[PDB]
Amino acid sequence: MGRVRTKTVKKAARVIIEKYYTRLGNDFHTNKRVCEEIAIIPSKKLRNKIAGYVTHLMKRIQRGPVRGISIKLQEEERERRDNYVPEVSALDQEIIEVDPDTKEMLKLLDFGSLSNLQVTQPTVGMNFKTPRGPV
Amino acid sequence: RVQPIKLARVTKVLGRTGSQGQCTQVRVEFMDDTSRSIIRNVKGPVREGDVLTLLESEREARRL
Amino acid sequence: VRRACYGVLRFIMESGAKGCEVVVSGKLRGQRAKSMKFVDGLMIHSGDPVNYYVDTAVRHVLLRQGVLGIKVKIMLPWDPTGKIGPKKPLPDHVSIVEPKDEILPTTPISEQK
Amino acid sequence: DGFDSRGKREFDRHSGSDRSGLKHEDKRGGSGSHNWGTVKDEL
Amino acid sequence: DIKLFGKWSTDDVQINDISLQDYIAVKEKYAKYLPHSAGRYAAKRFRKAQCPIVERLTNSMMMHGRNNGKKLMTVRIVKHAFEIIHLLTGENPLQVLVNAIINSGPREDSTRIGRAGTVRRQAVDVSPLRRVNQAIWLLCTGAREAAFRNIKTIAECLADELINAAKGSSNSYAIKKKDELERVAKSNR
Amino acid sequence: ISEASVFDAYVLPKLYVKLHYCVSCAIHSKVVRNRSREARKDRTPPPRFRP
RNA sequence: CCGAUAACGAACGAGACUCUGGCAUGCUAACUAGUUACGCGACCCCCGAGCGGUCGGCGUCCCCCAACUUCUUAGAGGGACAAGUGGCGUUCAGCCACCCGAGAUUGAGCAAUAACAGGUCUGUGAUGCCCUUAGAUGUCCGGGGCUGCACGCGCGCUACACUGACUGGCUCAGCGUGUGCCUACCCUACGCCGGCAGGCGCGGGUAACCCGUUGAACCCCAUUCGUGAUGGGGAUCGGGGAUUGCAAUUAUUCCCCAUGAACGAGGAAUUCCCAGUAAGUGCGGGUCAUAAGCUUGCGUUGAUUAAGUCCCUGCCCUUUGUACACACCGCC
Ligand SMILES: [Mg+2]
Ligand SMILES: [Mg+2]
Predict the structure, then answer these.
(1) Per-residue H/E/C for chain A
(2) In this structure, are residues E63 and E144 in contact, taking their beta carbons and an 8 Å threshold?
(3) HSE (CB half, 13 Å, CA atoms) of C42?
(4) Residue E22: closest C-alpha in chain B
(5) What is chain F's alpha carbon radius of gyration, rounded to the nearest angstrom?
(6) How many CB pairs under 8 A join C and D?
(7) Among all strands, which nt has the closest C1' to C92 (CA)?
(8) How far is the CA of C65 from the centre of ligand 2 (A)?
(9) Own/partner pairs for E27-33, CB < 8 Å, 24+ apart?
(10) Which of F17, C47, C45, B28 is nearest to E127 (CA)?
């Protein structure tokens, strides 16, 4: 146990990933070498801790976004998210089940008596609401 | 008259018990009848998968 | 002591330090002794870096009522040239150079020289 | 009678001096030359 | 083939109970020329399970202060005791030791903290590693107590302890202690 | 009890008792606990822990 | 730390850090460390072994008369990061196991805001006030005392035995010290005398140059003893002999010959401890003219149990109550 990282390594890992995402990769030794010149880290023992957290975070980044961000990642998600627009809309149903009261509302609005609207049998009982208190 | 001494296999370790952590609750299944599986408590270092003797079948079952 | 200590604090910070800390402990006009502490800025205490980051001094002041102890700790500012500050940077201090942002990934070209 | 047989006092907080006690009371609120300062001295 | 002490083949010894099969370490993989190795068997949990049981015996037989590090002396004691039991019973000393461990390991116990009636409140069944631990402890303590104030040496007392435990004859200290402990668990079921 | 019961399927009875406590006894026996100033205003009973 | 989130961004402490240990047949090197190779020997050899074997025997920076850093030393660089794989987890923080690996938690040092009328005025030319200051509470000198013994307690050492004791042989360390301002006092090799403690000459070493290849103990292998307060134990005491010191009585210490006491594993209780650890076992430093049953370190041999819990004992955080705030050693 006792391998929980510290703010000192986490802040630095986030910052260097944000700054040098293009230069860096998902190889530990490559990351521990690029860090040696992209940051003046006084200690080797902290440098390779930073490199390990960097590899962990970048392995995460390849799959999904995290709290640390990158502008290219934002643009990639924007250009990818506008997808699976169906060939047929989910809101063009051939029939629409409609209530008698809402049908009265439509005829008030003058847009009633549409062919697409199909009135349904109103519910009977008025058995909504839940029983009060426990039991 | 005595029920014969039998053997069982630990399938899972539930967790420590005894208010000193001196025993563990584990789940055991019988090789003599794999469907029959009860909750036993044992003392000593227990890993999952190990088999162990049982002098008597039904003593107590309690949830933590 | 409040005037003198605050003047010393101001002089230290004006001459430029990450922080400083003075303690005056002893008896003034009363039997019961009191210690008064005045701090400002950063001040590290533990580990190796304190040895070459913090300048310490302890003096005795002989008053008619007895003895007054003065303790002074000054966290020196980091100095690359090292004449007025420590040479090494703080071990936990990590600083990252910003990229040039001169990417320019345009159409391929060849430049002869 | 405030001490045991050896001579250590049985009530360490109970101050034995009439001039001063556990807490440091400040003379004249820390005023005068050879004294701790006050708010006016700080500013 | 391994020839523990140059003899006493390991491949003829079987652990007849599956409950102890995977904790006794007399098989060919754990078979070793000598009962001595600085193997870091207490590095972590369950590491002693793969430790050879003859090694465990020679590690538990160095006790009670005056002899805590004398592994060479304990190894020679184990050597002499194994030779004695081989010439006395007529089978493999390793098989004798395995059967002794099986019969010495108390199958149950009892443990609580509350107001005990006779010894301890709640009966419980022990783990196989606890079986091996307590069997080795009981056998070693029985041999040590037997060879305290008599002419009979440690090797001979250990020998008769294993011989009596391997069959069950009510005179072995380990067997008697197991009987008492099983009885108190039975009464405090 | 079920093993020694003569009947084939006996539904063992239940003891129904309505205890009343003074607050001294209730707090001493930990039926009720001291709660924060905000928590005191919650009249919802503690959960049954049924699952 | 992650997450929740009227907070966001930080700082001290923790961590990071320094030292130490573990790995580099990779680098720089070494007559104050050596190793291989080779040459002279010395012996076993002769069956003949013959590029046979042993040599801490002598040599090859005797500087012209080999190389090399593996062993040793000490510098710079590396290397380990939960990095790789599987499983669990909000699939986050991380946790478990396994592979490759020398190492997958080596030990320390440093160490916050503060509090303890905690301890030291017998550490000081640190120090206020009081006391004494010539028949001194200054200072010196002689002797005694700090050890004094119906008794109680604490840290300890040695034992109770055969898992042993004695006798002999074999065989292995690492810390580290070593000749002095004052200051008088060093570590010791070699030879000789004595049985020992010791004594007498002759060096070496201000030190990886000499002690020293620190021939340590435990242990290992052989002898005797034989369950007997006994060849276990060596307490108490008699006599004698040496050493240091100006001085050994109230025995400084050491040696030799004698008596041989309790003690046959220890009530109620109680201490310390998780891997090169406990424990067994010796060796240095400090104290020192003489002094270790102490302490601080080092090495050797080397385990059982556990990878959990709040039962006991405590401590911390939150909620809560407060007439306390010099804060329960309170107030009343
Ligand atoms: Mg630290
Ligand atoms: Mg005598």
Answers:
(1) CCCCCCHHHHHHHHHHHHHCCCCCCCCHHHHHHHHHHHECCCCHHHHHHHHHHHHHHHHHHHHCCCCCCCHHHHHHHHHHHCCCCCCCCCCCCCCEEECHHHHHHHHHHCCCCCCCEEECCCCCCCCCCCCCCCC
(2) yes
(3) 13
(4) B50
(5) 19
(6) 41
(7) G16
(8) 68
(9) E28/E1, E28/E2, E31/E2, E31/E4, E32/E2, E32/E4, E33/E2, E33/E3, E33/E4, E33/E5, E33/E6
(10) B28
How far is C102 from chain A, CA to nearest CA, in Å?
13
Neighbours of chain A (3+ CB pairs under 8 A): C
**Tokens representing residue A124 in the block:** 């009977």
Task: Specify the length of chain A in residues.
Answer: 135
The tokens describing B5, both together, are 């001494």
| Ligand 1 centroid distance, CA of C24 (Å) | 28
- Å resolution of this model? 2.6
- Taking 3-state DSSP, the helix, strand and coil percentages for chain D, each rounded to the nearest 5, stand at 15, 5, 80
Asked if the C-beta of D18 comes within 8 angstroms of chain C's C-beta atoms, the answer is: no
Alpha-carbon gap, residue D29 to A46, rounded angstroms: 52
Experimental method reported for this structure: cryo-EM
* Cα angle for residues E93, E98, E99 (degrees, 5° grid): 100
Second-level CATH architecture of A2-62 = Orthogonal Bundle (1.10)
Residue type at E189? R
List bases in chain G with any atom under 7 Å of a protein Cβ. Answer: 1-3, 10-18, 78-84, 92-97, 105, 109-119, 126-129, 160-164, 218-221, 226-228, 264-265, 274-276, 278-280, 300-311, 319-321, 326-327, 329-330
| Chains contacting B (3 or more CB pairs within 8 Å) | E
C93 interface with A at CB cutoff 8 Å = yes
